[PDB]
Coordinates of C-alpha atoms and ligand atoms in Angstrom, one line a residue:
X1 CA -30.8 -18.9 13.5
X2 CA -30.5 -16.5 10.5
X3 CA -30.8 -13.5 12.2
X4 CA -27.8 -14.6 14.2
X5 CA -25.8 -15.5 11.2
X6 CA -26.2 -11.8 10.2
X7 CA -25.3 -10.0 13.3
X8 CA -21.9 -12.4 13.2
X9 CA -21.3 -11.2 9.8
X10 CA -22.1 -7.7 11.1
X11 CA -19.9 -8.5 13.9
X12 CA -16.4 -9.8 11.7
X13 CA -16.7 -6.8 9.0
X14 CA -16.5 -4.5 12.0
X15 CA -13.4 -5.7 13.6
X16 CA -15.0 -5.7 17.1
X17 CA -17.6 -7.7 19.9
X18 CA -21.4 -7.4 19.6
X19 CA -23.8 -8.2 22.0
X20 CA -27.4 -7.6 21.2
X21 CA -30.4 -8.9 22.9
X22 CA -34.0 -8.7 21.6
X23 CA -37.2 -9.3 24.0
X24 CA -40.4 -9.6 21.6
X25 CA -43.5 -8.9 24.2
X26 CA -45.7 -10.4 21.9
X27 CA -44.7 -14.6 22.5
X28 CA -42.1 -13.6 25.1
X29 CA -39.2 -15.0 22.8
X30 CA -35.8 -14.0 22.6
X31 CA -33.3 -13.2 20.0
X32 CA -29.4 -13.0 22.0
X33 CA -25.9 -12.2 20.5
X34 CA -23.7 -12.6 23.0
X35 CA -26.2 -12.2 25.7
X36 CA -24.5 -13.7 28.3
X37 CA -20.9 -11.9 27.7
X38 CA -20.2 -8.4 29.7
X39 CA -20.2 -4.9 28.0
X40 CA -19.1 -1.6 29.6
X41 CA -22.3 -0.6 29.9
X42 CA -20.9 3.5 30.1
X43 CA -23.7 6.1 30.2
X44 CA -26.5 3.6 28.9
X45 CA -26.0 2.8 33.2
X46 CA -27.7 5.9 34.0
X47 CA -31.2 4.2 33.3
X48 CA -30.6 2.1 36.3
X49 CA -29.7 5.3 38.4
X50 CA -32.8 7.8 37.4
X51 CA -35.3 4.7 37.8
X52 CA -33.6 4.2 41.5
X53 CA -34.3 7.8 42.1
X54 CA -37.6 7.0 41.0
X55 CA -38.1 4.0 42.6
X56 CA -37.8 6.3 46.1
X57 CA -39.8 9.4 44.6
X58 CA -43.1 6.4 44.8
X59 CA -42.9 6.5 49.2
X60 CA -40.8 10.7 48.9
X61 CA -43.5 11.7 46.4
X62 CA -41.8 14.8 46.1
X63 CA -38.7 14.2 45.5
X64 CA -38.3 14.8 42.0
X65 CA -38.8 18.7 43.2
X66 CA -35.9 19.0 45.2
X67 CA -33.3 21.1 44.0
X68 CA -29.6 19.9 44.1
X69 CA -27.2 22.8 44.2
X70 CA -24.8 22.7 40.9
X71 CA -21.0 23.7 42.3
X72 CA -17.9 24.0 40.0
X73 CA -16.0 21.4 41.9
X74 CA -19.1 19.2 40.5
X75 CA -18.7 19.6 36.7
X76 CA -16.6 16.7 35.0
X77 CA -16.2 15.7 31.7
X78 CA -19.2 16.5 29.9
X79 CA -21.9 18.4 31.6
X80 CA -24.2 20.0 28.5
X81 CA -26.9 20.8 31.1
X82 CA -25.4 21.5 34.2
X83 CA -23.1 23.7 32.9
X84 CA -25.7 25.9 32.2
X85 CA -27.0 26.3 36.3
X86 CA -23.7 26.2 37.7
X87 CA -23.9 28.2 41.1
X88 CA -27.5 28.0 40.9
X89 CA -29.8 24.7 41.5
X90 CA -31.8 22.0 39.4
X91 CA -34.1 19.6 40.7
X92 CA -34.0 15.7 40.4
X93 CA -36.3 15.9 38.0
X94 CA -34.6 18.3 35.9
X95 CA -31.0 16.3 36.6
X96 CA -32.4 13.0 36.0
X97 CA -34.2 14.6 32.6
X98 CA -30.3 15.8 31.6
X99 CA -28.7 12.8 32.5
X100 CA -31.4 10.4 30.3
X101 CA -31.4 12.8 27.7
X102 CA -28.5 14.8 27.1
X103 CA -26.1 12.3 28.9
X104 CA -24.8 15.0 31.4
X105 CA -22.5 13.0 33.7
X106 CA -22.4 15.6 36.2
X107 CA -26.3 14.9 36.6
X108 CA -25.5 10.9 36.6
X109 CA -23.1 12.0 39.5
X110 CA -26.0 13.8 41.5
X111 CA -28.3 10.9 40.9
X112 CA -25.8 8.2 42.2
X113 CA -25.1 10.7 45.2
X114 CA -28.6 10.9 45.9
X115 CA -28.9 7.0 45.9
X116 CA -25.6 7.0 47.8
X117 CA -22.4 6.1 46.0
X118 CA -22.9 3.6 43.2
X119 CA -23.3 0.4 45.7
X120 CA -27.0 2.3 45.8
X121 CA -27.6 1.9 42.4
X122 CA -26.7 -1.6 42.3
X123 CA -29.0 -2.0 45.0
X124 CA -31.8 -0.6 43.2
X125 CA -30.8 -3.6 40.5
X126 CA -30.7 -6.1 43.0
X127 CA -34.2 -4.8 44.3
X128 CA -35.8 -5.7 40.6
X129 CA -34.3 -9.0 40.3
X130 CA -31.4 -7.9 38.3
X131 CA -28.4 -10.1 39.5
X132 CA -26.0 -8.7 36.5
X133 CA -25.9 -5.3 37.3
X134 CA -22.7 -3.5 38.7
X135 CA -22.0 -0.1 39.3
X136 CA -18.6 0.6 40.8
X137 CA -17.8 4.2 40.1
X138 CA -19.0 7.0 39.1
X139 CA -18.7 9.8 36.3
X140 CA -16.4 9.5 34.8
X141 CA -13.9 7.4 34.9
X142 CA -17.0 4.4 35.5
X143 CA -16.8 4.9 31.5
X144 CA -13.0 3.2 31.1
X145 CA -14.6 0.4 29.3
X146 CA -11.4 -1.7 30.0
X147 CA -10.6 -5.1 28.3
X148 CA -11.7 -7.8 31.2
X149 CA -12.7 -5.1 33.5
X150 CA -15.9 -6.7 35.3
X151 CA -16.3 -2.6 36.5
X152 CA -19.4 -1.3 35.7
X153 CA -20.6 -3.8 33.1
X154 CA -23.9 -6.0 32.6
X155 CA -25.0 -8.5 30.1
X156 CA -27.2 -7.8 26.8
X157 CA -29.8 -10.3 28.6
X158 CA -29.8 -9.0 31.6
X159 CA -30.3 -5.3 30.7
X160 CA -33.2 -6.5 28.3
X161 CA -34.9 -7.7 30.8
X162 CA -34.5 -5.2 33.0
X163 CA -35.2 -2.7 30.7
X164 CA -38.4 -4.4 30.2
X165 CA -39.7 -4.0 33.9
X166 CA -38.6 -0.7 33.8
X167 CA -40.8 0.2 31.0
X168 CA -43.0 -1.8 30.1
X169 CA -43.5 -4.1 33.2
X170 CA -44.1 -2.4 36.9
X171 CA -41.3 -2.5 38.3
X172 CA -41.8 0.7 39.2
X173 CA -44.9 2.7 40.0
X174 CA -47.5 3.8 37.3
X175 CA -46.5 7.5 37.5
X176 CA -43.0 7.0 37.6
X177 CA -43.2 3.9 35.1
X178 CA -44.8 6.9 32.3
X179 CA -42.2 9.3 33.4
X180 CA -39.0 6.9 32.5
X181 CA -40.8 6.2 29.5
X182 CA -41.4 9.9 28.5
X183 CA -37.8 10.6 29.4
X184 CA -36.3 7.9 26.9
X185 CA -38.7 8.9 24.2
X186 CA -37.3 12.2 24.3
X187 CA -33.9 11.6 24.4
X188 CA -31.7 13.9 21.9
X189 CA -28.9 11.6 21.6
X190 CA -30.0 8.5 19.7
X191 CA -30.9 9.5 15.7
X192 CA -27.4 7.5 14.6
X193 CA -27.9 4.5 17.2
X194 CA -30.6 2.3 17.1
X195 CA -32.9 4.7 15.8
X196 CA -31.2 5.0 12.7
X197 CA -32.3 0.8 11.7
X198 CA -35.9 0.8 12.3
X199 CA -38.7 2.2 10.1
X200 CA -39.5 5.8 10.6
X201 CA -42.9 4.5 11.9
X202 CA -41.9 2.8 15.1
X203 CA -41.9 4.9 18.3
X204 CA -39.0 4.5 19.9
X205 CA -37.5 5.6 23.7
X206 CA -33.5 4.8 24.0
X207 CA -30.2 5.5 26.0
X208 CA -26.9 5.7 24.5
X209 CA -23.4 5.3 26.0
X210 CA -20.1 5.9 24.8
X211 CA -15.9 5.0 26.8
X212 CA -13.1 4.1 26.0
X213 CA -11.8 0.9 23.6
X214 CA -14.3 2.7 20.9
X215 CA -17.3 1.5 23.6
X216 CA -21.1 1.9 21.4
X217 CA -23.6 1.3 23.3
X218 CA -27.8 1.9 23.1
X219 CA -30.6 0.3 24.4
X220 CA -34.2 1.1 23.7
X221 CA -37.9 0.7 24.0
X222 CA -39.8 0.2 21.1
X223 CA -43.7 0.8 19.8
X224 CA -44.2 -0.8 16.6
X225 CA -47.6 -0.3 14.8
X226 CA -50.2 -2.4 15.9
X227 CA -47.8 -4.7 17.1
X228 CA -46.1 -5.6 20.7
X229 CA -43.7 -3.8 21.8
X230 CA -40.2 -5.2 21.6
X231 CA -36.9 -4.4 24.0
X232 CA -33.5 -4.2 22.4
X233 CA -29.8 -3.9 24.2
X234 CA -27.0 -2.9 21.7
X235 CA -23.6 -3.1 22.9
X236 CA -20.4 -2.9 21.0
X237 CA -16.8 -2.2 21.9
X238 CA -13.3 -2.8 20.2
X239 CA -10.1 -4.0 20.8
X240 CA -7.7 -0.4 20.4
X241 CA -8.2 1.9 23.2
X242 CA -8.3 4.5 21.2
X243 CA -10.9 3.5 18.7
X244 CA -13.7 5.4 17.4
X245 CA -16.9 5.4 18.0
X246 CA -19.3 3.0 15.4
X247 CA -22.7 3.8 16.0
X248 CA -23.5 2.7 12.7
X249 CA -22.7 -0.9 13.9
X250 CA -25.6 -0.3 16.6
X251 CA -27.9 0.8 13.0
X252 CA -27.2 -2.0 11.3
X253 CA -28.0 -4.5 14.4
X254 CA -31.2 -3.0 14.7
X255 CA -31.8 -3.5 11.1
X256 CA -30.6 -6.5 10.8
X257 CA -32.9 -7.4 14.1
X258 CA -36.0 -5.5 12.6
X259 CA -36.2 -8.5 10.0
X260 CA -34.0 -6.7 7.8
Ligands
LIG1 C1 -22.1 7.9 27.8 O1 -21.5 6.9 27.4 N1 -21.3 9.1 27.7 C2 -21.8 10.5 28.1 C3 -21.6 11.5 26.9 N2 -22.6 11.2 25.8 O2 -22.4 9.8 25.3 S1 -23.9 9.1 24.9 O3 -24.8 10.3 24.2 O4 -23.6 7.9 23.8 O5 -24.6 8.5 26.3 C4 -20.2 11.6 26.5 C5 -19.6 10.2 26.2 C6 -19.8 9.2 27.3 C7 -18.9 9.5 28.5 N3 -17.5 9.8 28.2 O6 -19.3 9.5 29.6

């Protein structure tokens, strides 16, 4: 179709591969680029662990109060949050809150601990009918975004979907369904991603992710105006190692998306 045309444009003048996948709640129809191919999903995989932790908070129903001891021989490569309570505590609340919305990986590594090991998380997926899914590491070198790697990767469709039971569906229960939501809606990492191609009018909730091979990822919720809501995956990645990151490319695929 023509939006396709234009995210294939988008996708030669940027020298890489772009997967996007749009789920309109409104007829149920789809718009995919790529939707079938696997991205390094990176730190956009961290939805799947904080709704797993979720997911057992509905029979533990308070979970999300215990605290997690923060240790120096925890800390990796970026840890905005816990940095800030090492040799102290934070609850799973608090770590999942850090990991969804300041993409602290020593909280994603606390998360996938509590689950136990990443073969928990991908349970969690498997639980919700999401067959694409796969977490094999953790933080951080789950983020190598190699060439071919199936590690730690998911398709455009699948996460979409997912995505959409997350948030908008019931895959999870009704308190911990508005807390994920509130989380993404307050995430403090998106403003050059997806949010950047929309009008300043829609609402939106969103995870980034960021590796290696100049890996650009976001997904997000979204809350038109008196319209239904709409689910978009944005993955990009590139073929130098070394590459920088494009999160304009993830702008423009939301614009072009948007009916723009
Ligand atoms: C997620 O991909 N990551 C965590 C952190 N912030 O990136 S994000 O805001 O696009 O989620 C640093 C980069 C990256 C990583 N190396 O884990």
């Amino acid at each position: 179709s023509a939006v396709q045309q234009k995210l294939a444009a988008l996708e030669k003048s940027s020298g890489g591969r772009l997967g996007v996948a749009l789920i309109d709640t409104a007829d149920n129809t789809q718009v995919l680029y790529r939707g079938d191919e696997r991205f390094p999903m990176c730190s956009t995989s961290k939805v799947m662990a904080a709704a797993a932790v979720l997911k057992q908070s509905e029979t533990q129903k308070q979970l999300l109060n215990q605290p997690v001891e923060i240790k120096p021989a925890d800390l990796v490569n970026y840890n905005p949050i816990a940095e800030k309570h090492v040799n102290g505590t934070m609850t799973l609340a608090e770590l999942s809150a850090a990991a969804l919305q300041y993409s602290d990986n020593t909280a994603m590594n606390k998360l996938i601990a509590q689950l136990g090991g990443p073969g928990g998380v991908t349970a969690f997926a498997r639980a919700i009918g999401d067959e694409t899914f796969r977490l094999d590491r953790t933080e951080p070198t789950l983020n190598t975004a190699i060439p071919g790697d199936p590690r730690d990767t998911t398709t455009p469709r699948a996460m979409a979907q997912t995505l959409r039971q997350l948030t908008l569906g019931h895959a999870l229960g009704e308190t911990q369904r508005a807390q994920l939501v509130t989380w993404l809606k307050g995430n403090t990492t998106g403003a050059a991603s997806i949010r950047a191609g929309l009008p300043t009018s829609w609402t939106v909730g969103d995870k980034t992710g960021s590796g290696d091979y100049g890996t650009t990822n976001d997904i997000a919720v979204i809350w038109p105006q008196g319209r239904a809501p709409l689910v978009l995956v944005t993955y990009f990645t590139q073929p130098q190692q070394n590459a920088e990151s494009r999160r304009d490319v993830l702008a423009s695929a939301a614009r072009i998306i948007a009916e723009g």
